[PDB]
Design a protein around this ligand. Structure first.
Ligand code: MTX
Length: 159
């Protein structure tokens, strides 16, 4: 099935090719933990932000333009993206905003990071009626020396 994993700031602002706009260390850790050994689908920008292949995962870049790195898979359509995933049990969609929007309706799970931070940006995570999902895990964390904002991890399953 397909899952989306995203970092969200107040009002759902995301940094589309960034996360919940920023790059909280604790969040990147959670992100690795939950995407390792699974294929990850991302748009060009996010790839660019990342700058290298994410190790331990099959990197699939969804983009209309030709690739520039033979170490990852370049695809030009959601159909191709999925096929390249083969028959794994879970596909992780990592953003940005446009890719979230194309995959959200097909998704069955959401791995979210709620960061208590006001940030301005024009991009937000797509809307999802909270009444259609079910929270199965939550873990709140206060701001620390490493993470300047508090954040809360949450996993939801489509009901
Ligand atoms: C820009 N970006 C996209 C990004 C960032 N945070 C996210 N955070 C969440 N929760 N969800 C996303 N989809 C997400 N995407 C990045 C940037 C760096 C790395 C990265 O280096 N992660 C290493 C983790 C290494 C480390 O802990 O620094 C990895 O092995 O996954 C991943 C995604």
């Amino acid at each position: 099935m397909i899952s989306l994993i995203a970092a969200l700031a107040v009002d759902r602002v995301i940094g589309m090719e960034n996360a919940m706009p920023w790059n909280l260390p604790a969040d990147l850790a959670w992100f690795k933990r939950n995407t390792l050994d699974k294929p990850v689908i991302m748009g060009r920008h996010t790839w660019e932000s990342i700058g290298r292949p994410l190790p331990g995962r099959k990197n699939i870049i969804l983009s209309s333009q030709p690739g520039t790195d033979d170490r990852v898979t370049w695809v030009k359509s959601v159909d191709e993206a999925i096929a390249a995933c083969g028959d794994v049990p879970e596909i992780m969609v990592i953003g940005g905003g446009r890719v979230y929007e194309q995959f959200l309706p097909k998704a069955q799970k959401l791995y979210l990071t709620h960061i208590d931070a006001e940030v301005e940006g024009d991009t937000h995570f797509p809307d999802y009626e909270p009444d259609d999902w079910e929270s199965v895990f939550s873990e709140f964390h206060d701001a620390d020396a490493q993470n300047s904002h508090s954040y809360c991890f949450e996993i939801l399953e489509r009901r």
